[model samples]
Target chain A: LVPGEEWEFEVTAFYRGRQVFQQTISCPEGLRLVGSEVGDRTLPGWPVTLPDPGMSLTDRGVMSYVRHVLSCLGGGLALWRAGQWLWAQRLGHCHTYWAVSEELLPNSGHGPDGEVPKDKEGGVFDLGPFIVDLITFTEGSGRSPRYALWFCVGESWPQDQPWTKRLVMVKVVPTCLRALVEMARVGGASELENTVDLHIENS
Target chain B: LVPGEEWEFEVTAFYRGRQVFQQTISCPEGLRLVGSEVGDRTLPGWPVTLPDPGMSLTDRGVMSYVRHVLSCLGGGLALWRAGQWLWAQRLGHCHTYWAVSEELLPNSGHGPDGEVPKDKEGGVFDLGPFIVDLITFTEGSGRSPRYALWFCVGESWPQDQPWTKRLVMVKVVPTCLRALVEMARVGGASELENTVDLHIENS
Candidate 1:
């Protein structure tokens, strides 16, 4: 219904790291991927990594800088890619509470190789708007329940540069999301034997 | 230094989506990524999108389900890819207050096509150590700050399936992350003309 390429995708489903299925489907237009600021106080049990010079963890001030970046904070879409991902997010406009990714490129600037962007192109993906197949999902279980989610996006382009893809990957224990994720009937996978592990860095 | 693969990486820089520079580097290990979440309160400015049968959004509940998934809740990495991403999170062991992406695959389940993970592979990533690169960066300055971050992963494998790469992309407004992002000098790029835009969807 719009101009340009049909932003369709080839999705793959992974079952416990196994490939359950793969399919090509189109999602709704205006789909967005995103993140939010997560804090040490927000949840519990931190991975315990290094800290960012900018974030203030209060560990003896500068010592707070020793904390891990992931401990820092913030926060997906796919309505659940394959079920592997809750990474797919609807799209645009709604802030204050909802923080979205942004482009920081100079509209026009001197390029490194002095090559200016020849053209700018982007379009709303016109998919019959729906997720397909058994998307993989993963979560610790019985302390044991296993799920895997797979993420796939056609070579998507934006009107500008530095396009982003954001997904909220982990959240355990109870809060808002943790509870909801637990309740989702999206997965019909058999139970796991109760053992698992998970990481990322931040600035 | 772990096992499997060295898991190191080659990083790239993007200026306003333009290629800035490329470098191969190593970063500190142990990072975790996360998301907090958000709410529309009573009846917020719904995204005018589709719906999720499971959620309890109140567009009056049923219609509430139609609210753009991104608007739903929850909420990164990089410690910022080159600056394009904040996907890098520090690693290992932090819970309750923190919800993490977990493994949901059976440690020992017959595969879908009948190929069980021979090594009794994993469903969750279980990788850490670190993330490198501008780690690209972007933000609506005045608003302006065009940034771009490229994601790269070596052909790494998990104990179970092949492997997976997860990253976070957007967020505007001042939440816990917004403040830190603003303060961090992760980027010193030439700002955009004070007009940038941002997005995500969820279940």
Candidate 2:
């Protein structure tokens, strides 16, 4: 966790009819995580990892900028709350998938805040994990399906500022869903999909 | 709006251990849109259209099926609310894009409930006009990029039941964003993109 460190914050305000968001990197504060469970407790051997110190400060700065903007915007809160629910659903869906398949499929690889963690082991800590939920809907005869992936970043002081959440989606055919899952498990990027929507959600 | 006629509802329940959602359809009451603006106010020439009575009850039955499933699941509320916010943002972003482009580029076609809308005129009404928001982020220049599209379905009786929202995403490239917009404007379906994410959000 980033404790006792001076962190900088930036935010862009999007006013009605303005047509553009006013960007600003303002200030920072002192804080810490109060939760008893500081890290991932579910699915042992799959511990959550933290962001890499090696990652450029500019990159970290962008994450902080997005974090601050989302925190100021109530939409971000809704997103975080939704992310938490989606996280739960993602875990449940994955567990069910694994349980039903019984290891016929590969375990997914992930990180926190939508970025790859420095830890080689694949799990992340001190922030919400990048999670994927494969949902299948029965549309009459065949199933209509898609994949949802969400990422989150932990605020410097959880006791102080709000959490940040980002969600991404991949539209896949019923036939390609399995292949997409396999590709994601191995950390391969496919040109077939891209992010379509981004916004702040309040709790 | 379909006011006096009796309306039916259907939904699917996804139990914890069960992989598939249990489907059921129920009955409903009469309702109407309360807001002064009952139609699409954004795109002037385009008017909101209602599902046809000639359109089999089975068709509306599918919409109700998704609605009930989402309504029963609490997460659906959150998804609906988030979708609303996202929808607003998408509209804002598009407005900005168009304003900046000054119609220099072709207008994009859109659908109701994030899916391609059936009406050829390219506008939807009731609850909210069908919308899609495309956002981009720089994760260190040229690392990689993706696109996302979400579809939503407006509910039958907005005042009676909690507004039901469904969002679906499809990934695409930056270049294709404009084409996607134009395609949405014309009511054409591109083999390149499809829906992936569906959930509800709160107000």
Candidate 3:
């Protein structure tokens, strides 16, 4: 089985005198099961009834789960009626919203607070060193109200030390983004966070 | 509305002379309608029949679509019975297999054709260079089967430009991976491909 994935298998044996026996087994991480045939029951009646050997395995991670949800929402081949019949319950209170990301060029009339960068000092510089800067709509806003995001690079110290970076005023859209944030919120960061690696360097 | 996403809204108007005027409006990108109360049909006979403004907008992406499929496959909350009721047809030929990624360290016993790197001339060095490696059960392999993988870094060339890095042998699990490959196979590379940036630097 994949290191980060899980699978379940069940084996049931019927004994002539004893009651039915069944047990489920899960494959451990980083290991896969090879061939193994079930031997004949030695102490069983002629007509021994064998229970079903159910097998179910699923992969973990928010991305996989979220993708599955969207595919169901689209209901590609299935008609609208059938799709509703299948996914209506899971989709209750689900509303879709647009997520906007724009580049903040100098003097742009864009920004959560509507601040323009005339020079390097007053506007953008006042915001400090942020690698990512963008505005978005609030969940309750009908006019696509602006919200800001800033990934600030820490202040440069004496000598030549590397600067640290952190996200500030992180805002997420209500639909999929909200779901993703929730998955990684309560508990510590999940495997989903490590799915990608980002490397940024000055040219 | 988000620029890349689309939502469909239908409006039906009924007048004394006109039989029934019904039209569907797509909320254009970058525009959102706000504050316009439903007005009485002045030319209507008595009651006005306005269809419900059912809203369902989904973004277009292969990953999101794939996750939803896997979610349905696992049927987390729903028992097998409920899952069957929801997704019987889709599960017809469905099965899970392990995807192993083994780093073929020096003298590693893994390869596609079992040709090990006995030395610099005939051993793993012939396999080529890759940072990741792995194998998977062949599609028709019974319940399970063992497979091997080997990734070798390419030979450094004469005092020249960097050696082109590429996936020597890309292996993907069935199901979602298969579906993704199929999607991109029929159509060209999608926006999803453009979403990621890969940079390799030589020391």
Candidate 4:
């Protein structure tokens, strides 16, 4: 959160209980560092810098399929699989809440080429600004409940990883959250008890 | 499942992980044993149970206020809380599966007197026919995951005595039988395989 410094952060990869990998990423300058995928990035020459095909860069620019073919030609299917696998692994290692937030992040027509456009900017500046989106998986339960969690940060590049803020972290437990909605239904602060417990004598 | 023979089965009850109680239930003929709930017998001399002060049963079968009173008295806040707790406990204990079948059991309706109608000739069926009504608490997953595992035959409904069921158990994971709309979207299952052996090879 240092002012104007490229936000640098590390995400730990857990294969079961073991720490299998750790990735370090720095955000680009004005673009802001909203969040990064939480998977294996070392799948060999990722984002594999493609040569731009002479496709129309409309007012709303579209990455050309020809460029995809070019990347496939230059980097073989193994590389393509690695690239895809990198995202999948990142997504796989992702805590369900993080994956949901990334998918639900509002694309505000910002970002390289207008691909991520949804709001005025494409990043999260405030933790409270994000909205929760529930994504239920068709199967799985226990620690691996078959559900995805998403957050909607309308159209702005994220200035900080939303998870860094305590507010976002507190909402991660899905079980007791049902009680939050129940409290809200009756016009009460369901989180009051939790907040009190956490900050009883702090202030 | 023996005809005319009363077979007793033992089951332990738990609140959270701690064992709360243990009881033996008997499974008798013509009825299957299902889960448990507080019986809805009319409260002695409660105003709702009293014959309508306005009308004679000889004329009108059942009046609206009388019916409303019966419903209100029957579905009181205490009963609702009891049902809710029992349901939450059931969810915690059983592996729930969605029962896709849409058939309602016979003779399980209210009578002209607004009382629960019975299937058998004499009133031996207060809890009504069949077991398991599709309610919101059971979206599957959790204890009682398999809706089919519940049975409610005769002799499983003694108020003071511990209830029992026949020895015809068919246990399967309720979540396993579910069909996924998109199989590839299941990152958790794949993650589960990566984390642990999963051992779910049943066809």
After TM-score superposition, what is the CA distance of residue A152 in candidate 3 from its true location, in Å? 7.4
Worst 10 residues of 1 chain B by lDDT: B94-103
Best TM-score goes to which candidate? 4
Q: Candidate 3 residues A1-203, lDDT tens each? A: 34423323232221111113334444332111111222432211111122221111111121232233223221111101111111111111111211122111011113223221111112211111111121111221112211121211111111111111110011111122233332332322221211121111113
Model 4 Cα lDDT, one tens digit per residue, A63-180: 2322322332321111011111111111111111123222112112233121222122232122222212111111111111211122211111222322211111101112223333
**Per-residue lDDT over A1-203 for candidate 1, one digit per residue giving the tens place of the 0 to 100 score:** 34323233433322112233334444434122222333433322221121232333221222221122122222212122222122233222211111111112111112111111112222111112212111232232222122222222111122222222111121111122222234432333212222222121112
lDDT of 1 by residue, B1-203 (tens): 34332223333322112233334433333111222232422321211111232233211222221122223222212221222122232121211111111112111112222211212221212122111111233322222222222221111112233111111112111122223333433344222222322221221
- iRMS, candidate 4, in Å: value is 24.9
TM-score of 2: 0.19
Docking class of 2: incorrect
Candidate 1 CAPRI level: incorrect
Error of 3 at A181 (Å): 13
Candidate 1, superposed: residue stretches over 4 Å from native: A1-156, A159-161, A165-203, B1-203
Model 4 TM-score, all chains together: 0.20
lDDT of each: 0.23, 0.21, 0.19, 0.21
Q: Any runs in candidate 2 off by more than 4 Å, and if so which?
A: A1-47, A51-60, A64-203, B1-64, B67-119, B123-149, B154-175, B178-203
Give the per-residue lDDT of model 4 (tens digit) for B1-203.
34423323233321111123334443332121123233643321111122231232111111232233223222221100111111111111121111111111111111111111222122211111122322211332211111212211111211221111111111111221222211211211111111111111123
lDDT of 3 at B189: 25
State residue A59's C-alpha deviation in candidate 4, in Å.
53
Number of the top lDDT candidate: 1
